Amino acid sequence: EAFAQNVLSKADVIDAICIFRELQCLTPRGRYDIRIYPTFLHLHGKTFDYKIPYTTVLRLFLLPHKDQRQMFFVISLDPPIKQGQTRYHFLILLFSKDEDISLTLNMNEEEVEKRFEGRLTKNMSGSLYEMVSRVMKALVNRKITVPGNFQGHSGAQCITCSYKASSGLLYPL
DNA sequence: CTGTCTCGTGCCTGGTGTCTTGGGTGTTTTCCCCTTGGCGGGGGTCTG
Numbered sequence: 001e002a003f004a005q006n007v008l009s010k011a012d013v014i015d016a017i018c019i020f021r022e023l024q025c026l027t028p029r030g031r032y033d034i035r036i037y038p039t040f041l042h043l044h045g046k047t048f049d050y051k052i053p054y055t056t057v058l059r060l061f062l063l064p065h066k067d068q069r070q071m072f073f074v075i076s077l078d079p080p081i082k083q084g085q086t087r088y089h090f091l092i093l094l095f096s097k098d099e100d101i102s103l104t105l106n107m108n109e110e111e112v113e114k115r116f117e118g119r120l121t122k123n124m125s126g127s128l129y130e131m132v133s134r135v136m137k138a139l140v141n142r143k144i145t146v147p148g149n150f151q152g153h154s155g156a157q158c159i160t161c162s163y164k165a166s167s168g169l170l171y172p173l
Numbered sequence: 174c175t176g177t178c179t180c181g182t183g184c185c186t187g188g189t190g191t192c193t194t195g196g197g198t199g200t201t202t203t204c205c206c207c208t209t210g211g212c213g214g215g216g217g218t219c220t221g
Contacts (some may be wrong), residue, residue: 028191029189029190029191030190083192084192084193085192085193086191086192086193
């Protein structure tokens with residue numbers, strides 16, 4: 001804080017709409033902060049960084065976990081973000097239902113009303129996954145797909161099955 | 174009084190996950206190759 005104050009005392013600072021710090025990502029793997037912009041999102045990592053325009057997004061999927069304790073937030077990309085010799089077709093995020101948050105936008109009330117048409121507010125609070133879903137919806141306009149009318153025998157909304165030498169969850173959307 | 178189990182941080186390190194690479198192996202992709210696509214004079218032969 002002292003260094004920041006010393007910097008501000010000499011600089012003339014004039015941005016991101018909202019910044020989520022450290023969100024459990026599964027594809028790619030690791031903790032990544034997410035900065036929101038009017039036309040894209042900056043996925044900042046401890047080493048690698050990516051920038052996904054909203055024009056590249058195709059679908060947003062919000063799925064529950066088999067144990068009913070976690071939430072999967074999937075973003076379908078196009079073109080896929082590239083990293084050396086690998087291309088990711090989906091951005092997967094993992095959240096916990098008991099992981100709340102309180103966010104405040106970097107905009108004013110009237111500007112938010114004009115931009116998001118009242119879909120968002122200057123200050124919000126609620127579950128982390130709910131907040132991310134609401135923000136991404138208000139940004140992309142695409143509706144977030146949710147599980148259908150399927151309910152497995154174990155009461156879960158998916159089936160545990162293998163695929164390409166790897167276990168995982170299959171959701172009938 | 175009292176101290177042992179528990180919650181809640183710091184700290185760090187070592188253990189998880191996955192790019193990246195190499196080998197095995199089936200499959201397309203071109204080029205090459207093989208199969209294919211007017212007039213007359215006679216003669217004899219058959220039928221009645």
